Amino acid sequence: GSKKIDDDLFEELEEQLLIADVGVETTRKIITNLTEGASRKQLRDAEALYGLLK
Asked: Which spans are transmembrane here?
């Protein structure tokens, strides 16, 4: 058995994968850096506060 399919379909699919992939990784860097940044700031602020002692 054999389905014959044009390279346009496979090209389009590969293109959409790329797009979606790029969106996903861009989203992941951004969320993660900001969330790491949120963490770092809790530690820094908490330490600063604790800096005040007598």
From this structure: none
- Give dist(CA 43, CA 18) in Å, integer: 38
Q: What tokens appear for 34 in the block?
A: 């900001």
Report residue 15 as tokens.
Answer: 């293109």
Distances (CA, A) of 28 to 16, 23, 31, 42: 18, 9, 5, 21
Alpha helices (H) in 1-54, listed in sequence order: 7-51
Resolution, angstroms, 1 dp: 2.7
d(CA 48, CA 3): 67
